[PDB]
Nucleic acid binder design. Structure first.
Ligand SMILES: [Zn+2]
Lengths: 222, 105, 111, 14, 1113
DNA sequence: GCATCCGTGAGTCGAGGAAGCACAATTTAACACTTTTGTCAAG
DNA sequence: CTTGACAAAAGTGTTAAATTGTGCTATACTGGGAGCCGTCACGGATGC
């Protein structure tokens, strides 16, 4: 079983676990030798360990069996046709309930992750990680434009009244919290929901008027 | 200054029925000498319409008033049988050497 | 304050457990289909923090209002995602294992 | 000693 | 432009096919043309006959024959669809049940074997690739002197690489011979007893020597039975394993007697027979027959070692670096080795499969798993060091690349493990390996080029041709001989004068065992075919090679490869005669197969009517993008109705003029300093070159995008990109791709793609902005393809491949792929690198107008100005002679062919210059013009300098100056003459692939790395410049503490620091004080992961948290 | 004092990206129903 | 500033379908396979 994603000693130890299970379940009344019954459990344990531990991204045993069956069918069709089969033939040969899309998705799932330290070039001075940009942390441009947008919005809200600006900040999450509903803001200010909605709409209209007369905030919309 | 060949999009293409590609046609046109008989004229357009099999030269341009071709024997292209060459060449007047990337006419 | 000296010293098992935010009990890295990290795995959000800023795994807290809070449904602390670069784990070995740097580095310090 | 498989085989051969 | 040829050496044989090293070897390996019954046991057929039959031990899987089918797709289709040009390989196998006595035969499909194109290169995954031949130590028996102890020698038995362990035999101080295998040393007496040798036999054979034979006699081992001796040998080799006779004999047989595991090789066996004077039955150290071991090579090796130690006259040590002891593995041998590895893996899989599961009902198709073989083959053809990405900038580039020999690669030397011994030019490199041509730098001497006349033999030893000389007369008989055979004869030189066929010179310069000697014509045994056989293809293209220093001729030959094709490329004025041969053998041009008449001529195809009447249509490769980005196009050179003879030219290939290799332009070059613009190899060009489109090339760039399937939704390639104006989408058609022929600039969109945005709430400021503007956020975002900065051009091709297309095997999860080929016409500009065949290279530093360049008295301005100071230091005098000959040709209207080391000499160039001056000044006399006053002043200054004879008329002084190659050159600015005559001529200058347009790069902010958060590297990835250790040391030396701190923190990895600095700069403020870098945080975290407590302290030794409490529980 | 195994090091940029089968335990898409608003009329 | 009617947006509670994980195969099998190789110099222990 060597060369299937697990080292030799790992396979030996998993087979030892299977052997212990076989000893637990072995019955000598049937007059069969221990090797015959123990082989089943040893190979079962080895195969289960290969299915559960030979991939960096774990795949369930049923999906591993599906991938193995798909690979066997693809290999058989490839040797029969003398060429690489298309997804249609593989799906047809697999059986009912299989189409080209499902075969493509299964093949996509069966893609092992690629190492980040694989050298490229004659010299051992390059790696994959040197060509993969980091797209999680904001770029300096993104942080700068976010700060500019915050400053411009704060300056624009100064034109609004004291209550209207606070209502808009509460309703849009400018207080770092989740956008408070109309009833929450109304209870905070002791006002009914309809009046809160009306004052928010009036303040939004006033901000629209100011933006139309100034056009100092449109570029940040993108 | 400018050239437009019918059914040709860019200068990196080959015209069917023509031995020379568009690059070679442009190179041949760059050697064309045009004399304006009218000083006030600044830009002219010469129309060439030829059908193979022939050797289309600079003399095959349609005559234009107050315009003369000083080298009618200049070789422009070789049209194979079944090939056609319809083109318009815009010639302007200027000074110095103006690269095509600058004027972009 | 300003950093003036740097000290390096052996890390006791108690100190190592103090550093860790949780024991990594499974080798699973991520799910193959949902692409979310598996619980108690090498990439668990419950140990090393959320993938994105201010968002729990269960998707109940999604704002800075609950800053410094640990969700009861999922256990993922609601904080900046950058803590994922700074939060470590620990594996509790069944039996002790010697550090190779103190064994094969001649002269062997343990020896 | 250097090969773990060799040591394991020697152990199981006893 | 008539061609005048110089030289007196008459070559008896033409140049061999320059690509035969790659083509013939692969033809031998495949054997796809010879019928299966006539196939010999070489190549993959030998691999089949070696691994097969497979025995379970009563099931036998035997191999009968193999065949190769037609390739599924042509070369053009494979290139367009990014496929691999390969042919299906099927094997015919039979399954025999020994007990039952039944045979089951069927043809199994082993897979695909990549095919070689006619030019000698493969097409792997749609990319042209070349397999580089590997030079290594030939297998066999060598006897090297022990450096540690003088007077002693050690025998080395070397099998094929990865085909057995190297065996060492040494004479220990005690007198007992020691055999070393796999770093384990043991007494050779034991293994020699295993081979069934008695004391009497050794005493009678090796006893006629010193005390070595007496030391070889140990009664402890001799009294031991061969079986017990074998068990003891197995115990010594492998300790711990239980002593079992079957396992021990199996291990010994697999170590020194198994042909499947040990393979001395055909070359190894031949070398062993040649050296030890024995006849090996096979290619193994020992033969296992009749249940016993029989000696093959150990006894002769020991006898030779003992005789060498004693000092017999007939035995000598072996030179490890001798080129007769070093062999070449071509594409055929490497492919055969990899096929053998894959077939061994397949046989192992069959064996482990044929012993389990329905043994009675078995077929060869079920047992055979062809996946390991295909995996090994694709690994060899893709991820191997010797399988290099083809360099096809010009036909000469590919031609050299196919003829390269590399000492590196799998199983060979290494760049930093190689000493001076392998990098030096051995005496046997004469006529087999080019001495001058090699990549300078860390790979000097490790990569070389095969000589022009050299050819690799069947066994892999490079041979060179020599003319047989008998009785003092040189015959036309040519013998191709190797170095070891070459060392046994006195070989004359090709430049020896001949009175017809008889040698005229009484004293002949010859070579004896690689050393120069002076001999008589009677003692001459062989002669050189020609001076060209010593140098490779590139060096044979350098005129006046004898006047160039080797270090600079190396650079010239290397840079001849990097010359890009030009739309107005013209052949050099001074040639060597190999241009036509290079063009013909590079398969870049188009030639008529036989006599015929051209019926149709077109820019796309040529239709020819041959004599037999058949219509043959040759398509013309037009504006095809090469591997290096250059445009490879074929231009027809015939007309309709023109009759062509067999072998005549039909269409010029890339970088060719009428079948002659044209890598550059013949320009008027004046050798003089010019206002400091020539400083330090810089080159000054005239604007006249740009006016008439010289050094103007076409470069095609390929931009690839892929629309895939995503969990958020499938990416769609469409023209409707959100939040984009109509101006940006002007060039995009209805399908979202840029229209063919549209001009694109940096920042313009080539193909429009929209990707579904990740489900995530927006920031509160963005939500407030959207509410203010009343614009609902769309579900897709712009992820289209845009032209990177510094690129652009004219879009000439668009290729759209979709899933389900015939033969398009897209990667899983990818809906479609769009490739855009954009062609730009690059002209010469400041910063572009020019060079010449003599190694004089430099970047264009100034483009002067026509009226500023120095001009001849007849009004002809020079085109290029060169700094003379590059001549004396570099000692490349060949460029001066080429300049003189080019001046003569320019004023005579003719070209010259001067072969290297036998061609134009000084008197011939002087008489040509005399004729050129005669016509040049007779024209002026006929026009009615005398001698310029400025010319008179220059002549006076020259005669003050001793350049001309005083007292002569101005015409005679001008003629003398012209004979010296110098002319009176005026200044284009002042109008006054240059105070001294200036060497003005016509020189062939190439435009190299290194251009400032592709090398200029700049970056303010861009992508950052994953772990360290530092900026990426490379122009393609838009990365920053590496500020390594040495720059930091320079900054420390200057004491620029703040600049260094900024470059370490603010500009590199201080995330908060860099964000704040950018925000401050865009706000007009000063950048803030930097903070701790992220790299130090990564350092601390990794050290903690190594169970080391790294703590940062303050003045009072209190811990300081650099993580701002984010890592504190 | 000396032969010998082991470990570490050997320039800088750039341009190179091989079982299935049954069965039980866990998750979740699909609905059905209250709950909670967001907004609209009425001044 | 309020007081009622509507119309979705989100959450709660089943429902089985899909997915996932563990148990089981009873002639007899009883110690591995790949290496394998062209470098020199300098600590520095490891013994004789
Ligand atoms: Zn949560």
């Amino acid at each position: 079983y060597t060369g299937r994603g697990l080292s030799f000693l790992d396979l030996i130890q998993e087979g030892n676990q299977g052997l212990i299970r076989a000893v637990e379940k072995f019955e000598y009344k049937r007059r069969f030798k221990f090797s015959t019954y123990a082989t089943w459990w040893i190979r079962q344990a080895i195969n289960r360990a290969i299915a559960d531990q030979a991939r960096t991204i774990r795949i369930p045993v049923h999906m591993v069996e599906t991938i193995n069956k798909l690979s066997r069918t693809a290999r058989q069709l490839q040797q029969e046709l003398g060429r690489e089969p298309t997804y249609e033939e593989i799906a047809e040969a697999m059986g009912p309930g299989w189409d080209a899309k499902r075969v493509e998705e299964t093949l996509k799932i069966a893609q092992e992750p690629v190492s980040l330290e694989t050298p490229i070039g004659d010299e051992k001075d390059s790696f994959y990680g040197d060509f993969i940009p980091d797209e999680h942390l904001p770029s300096p441009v993104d942080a700068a434009t976010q700060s500019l947008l915050s400053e411009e919005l704060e300056k624009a809200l100064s034109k609004l009244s004291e209550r209207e600006a606070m209502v808009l900040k509460l309703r849009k999450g400018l207080i770092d919290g989740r956008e408070h509903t109309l009833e929450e803001v109304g209870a905070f200010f002791g006002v009914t929901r309809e009046r809160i909605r009306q004052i928010e709409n009036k303040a939004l209209r006033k901000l629209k008027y100011h933006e139309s007369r100034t056009r100092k905030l449109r570029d940040f919309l993108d | 200054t400018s050239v437009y060949i019918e059914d040709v999009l860019h200068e990196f293409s080959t015209i069917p029925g023509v031995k020379e590609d568009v690059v070679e046609i442009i190179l041949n046109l760059k050697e064309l000498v045009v004399r304006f008989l009218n000083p006030s004229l600044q830009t002219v357009t010469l129309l060439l319409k030829a059908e193979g099999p022939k050797e289309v030269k600079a003399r095959d341009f349609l005559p234009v008033a107050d315009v003369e071709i000083m080298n009618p024997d200049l070789h422009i292209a070789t049209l194979e049988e079944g090939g056609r060459l319809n083109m318009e060449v815009r010639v302007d007047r200027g000074v110095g050497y103006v690269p095509a990337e600058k004027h972009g006419i | 304050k300003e950093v003036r000296k740097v000290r390096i010293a052996l890390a006791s098992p108690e100190k190592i457990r103090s550093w860790s935010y949780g024991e990594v009990e499974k080798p699973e890295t991520i799910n193959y289909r949902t692409l979310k990290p598996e619980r108690d795995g090498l990439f668990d959000e419950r140990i090393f923090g959320p993938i994105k800023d201010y968002e729990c795994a269960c998707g109940k807290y999604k704002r800075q209002r609950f800053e410094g809070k640990v969700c009861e449904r999922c256990g993922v602390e609601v904080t900046k995602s950058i803590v994922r670069r700074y939060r470590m784990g620990h594996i509790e070995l069944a039996t002790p294992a010697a550090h190779i740097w103190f064994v094969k580095d001649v002269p062997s310090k343990i020896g | 000693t250097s090969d773990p498989v060799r040591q394991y085989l020697h152990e199981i051969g006893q | 432009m008539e061609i005048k040829r110089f030289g007196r050496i008459r070559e008896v044989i033409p140049l061999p096919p320059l690509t035969e090293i790659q083509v013939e070897s692969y033809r031998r390996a495949l054997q796809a043309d010879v019928p299966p019954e006539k196939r010999e046991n070489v190549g993959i057929q030998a691999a089949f006959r070696e691994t097969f039959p497979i025995e379970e031990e009563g099931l036998v899987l035997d191999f009968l024959e193999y065949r190769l089918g037609e390739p599924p797709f042509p070369q053009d289709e494979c290139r367009e669809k990014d496929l691999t040009y390969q042919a299906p390989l099927y094997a015919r196998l039979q399954l025999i049940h020994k007990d039952t006595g039944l045979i089951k035969e069927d043809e199994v499909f082993l897979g695909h074997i990549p095919l070689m194109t006619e030019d000698g290169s493969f097409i792997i995954n749609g990319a042209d690739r070349v397999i580089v031949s590997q030079i290594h130590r030939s297998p066999g028996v060598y006897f090297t002197p022990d450096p540690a102890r003088p007077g002693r020698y050690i025998a080395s038995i070397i099998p094929l690489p990865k085909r057995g362990p190297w065996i060492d035999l040494e004479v220990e101080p005690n007198g007992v011979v020691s055999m070393k295998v796999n770093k384990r040393k043991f007494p050779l007496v034991l293994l020699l007893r295993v081979l069934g040798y008695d004391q009497e036999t050794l005493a009678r054979e090796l006893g006629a020597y010193g005390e070595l034979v007496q030391g070889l006699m140990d009664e402890s081992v001799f009294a031991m039975r061969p079986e017990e001796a074998l068990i003891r040998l197995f115990t010594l080799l492998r300790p711990g394993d239980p002593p079992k006779r079957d396992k021990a004999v199996a291990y010994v047989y697999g170590l020194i007697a198994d042909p499947r595991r040990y393979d001395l090789g055909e070359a190894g066996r031949y070398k062993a027979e040649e050296k030890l004077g024995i006849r090996l039955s096979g290619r193994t150290l020992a033969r296992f027959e009749d249940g016993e071991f029989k000696d093959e090579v150990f006894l002769p090796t020991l006898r030779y070692l003992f005789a060498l130690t004693a000092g017999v006259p007939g035995h000598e040590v072996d030179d490890i670096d001798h080129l007769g002891n070093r062999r070449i593995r071509t594409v055929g041998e490497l492919m055969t080795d990899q096929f053998r590895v894959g077939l061994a893996r397949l046989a192992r899989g069959v064996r482990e499969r044929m012993l389990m599961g329905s043994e009675d009902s078995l077929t060869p198709a079920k047992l055979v798993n062809s996946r390991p073989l295909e995996a090994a083959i694709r690994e060899f053809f893709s991820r191997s060091q010797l399988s290099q990405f083809k360099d096809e900038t010009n036909p000469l580039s590919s031609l050299r690349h196919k003829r390269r020999i590399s000492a590196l690669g799998p199983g060979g030397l290494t760049r930093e493990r190689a000493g001076f011994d392998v990098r030096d030019v051995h005496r046997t490199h004469y006529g087999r390996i080019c001495p001058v041509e090699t990549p300078e730098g860390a790979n000097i001497g490790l990569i070389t080029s095969l000589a022009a006349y050299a050819r690799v033999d069947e066994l892999g030893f490079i041979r060179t041709p020599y003319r047989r000389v008998v009785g003092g007369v040189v015959t036309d008989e040519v013998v191709y001989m190797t170095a070891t055979e070459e060392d046994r004869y006195t070989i004359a030189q090709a430049n020896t004068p001949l009175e017809g066929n008889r040698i005229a010179a009484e004293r002949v310069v010859a070579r004896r065992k690689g050393e120069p000697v002076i001999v008589s014509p009677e003692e001459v045994e062989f002669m050189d075919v020609s001076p060209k056989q010593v140098f490779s293809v590139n060096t044979n293209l350098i005129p006046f090679l004898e006047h160039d220093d080797a270090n600079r001729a190396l650079m010239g030959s290397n840079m001849q490869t990097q010359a890009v094709p030009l739309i107005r490329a013209q052949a050099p004025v001074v040639m060597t005669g190999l241009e036509e041969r290079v063009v013909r053998d590079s398969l870049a041009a188009l030639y008529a197969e036989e006599d015929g008449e051209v019926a149709k001529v077109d820019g796309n195809r040529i239709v020819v009517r041959y004599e037999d009447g058949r219509l043959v249509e040759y398509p013309l490769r037009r504006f095809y993008r090469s591997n290096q980005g250059t445009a490879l196009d074929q231009r027809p050179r015939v007309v309709v109705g023109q009759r062509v003879r067999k072998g005549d030219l039909l269409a010029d290939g890339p970088a060719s003029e009428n079948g002659f290799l044209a890598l550059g332009q013949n320009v008027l070059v004046a050798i003089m300093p010019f206002d400091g613009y020539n400083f330090e190899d810089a080159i000054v060009i005239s604007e006249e070159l740009l006016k008439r489109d010289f050094y103007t090339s076409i470069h095609i760039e390929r931009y690839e995008i892929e629309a895939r399937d995503t969990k958020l939704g499938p990416e769609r390639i469409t023209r409707d990109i959100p939040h984009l104006s109509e101006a940006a989408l002007r060039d995009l058609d209805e399908e979202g791709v840029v229209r063919i022929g549209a001009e694109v600039k940096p920042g313009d969109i080539l193909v429009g793609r929209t990707s579904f945005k990740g489900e995530s709430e927006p920031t509160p400021e963005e939500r407030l902005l959207r509410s203010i503007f009343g614009e609902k956020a769309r579900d897709v975002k712009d992820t289209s393809l845009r032209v990177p900065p510094g690129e652009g051009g004219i879009v000439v091709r668009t290729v759209r491949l979709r899933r389900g297309d015939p033969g398009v095997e897209l990667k899983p999860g990818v809906r479609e792929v769009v490739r855009v080929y954009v062609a730009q016409k690059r002209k010469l500009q400041v910063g572009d690198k020019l060079a010449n065949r003599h190694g004089n290279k430099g970047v264009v530093a100034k483009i002067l107008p026509v009226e500023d360049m120095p001009h001849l008295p007849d009004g002809t301005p020079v085109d290029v100005i060169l700094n003379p100071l590059g001549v004396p230091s570099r000692m490349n005098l060949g460029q001066i002679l080429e300049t003189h000959l080019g001046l003569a040709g320019y004023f005579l209207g003719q070209r010259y062919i001067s072969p290297i080391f036998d061609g134009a000499k000084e008197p011939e160039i002087k008489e040509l210059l005399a004729q050129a001056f005669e016509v040049y000044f007779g024209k002026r006399k006929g026009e009615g013009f005398g001698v310029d006053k400025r010319e008179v002043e220059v002549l006076r200054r020259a005669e003050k300098l001793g350049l001309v004879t005083p007292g002569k008329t101005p015409e005679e002084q001008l003629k003398e100056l012209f004979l010296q190659g110098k002319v009176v050159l005026y200044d284009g600015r002042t109008g006054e003459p240059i105070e001294g005559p200036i060497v003005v001529g016509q020189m062939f200058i190439m435009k190299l692939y290194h251009m400032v347009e592709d090398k200029m790069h700049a970056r303010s902010t861009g992508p950052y790395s994953l772990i360290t958060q530092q900026p990426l590297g490379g122009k393609a990835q838009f990365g920053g410049q590496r500020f390594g250790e040495m720059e930091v040391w320079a900054l420390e030396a200057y004491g620029a503490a703040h600049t260094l701190q900024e470059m370490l923190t603010l500009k590199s990895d201080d995330i908060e620091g860099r964000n704040a600095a950018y925000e401050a700069i865009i706000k007009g403020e000063d950048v803030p004080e930097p903070s701790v870098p992220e790299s130090f945080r990564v350092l601390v975290k990794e050290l903690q992961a190594l169970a080391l407590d790294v703590q940062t302290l303050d003045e009072k030794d209190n811990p300081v948290d650099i993580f701002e409490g984010l890592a504190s529980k």
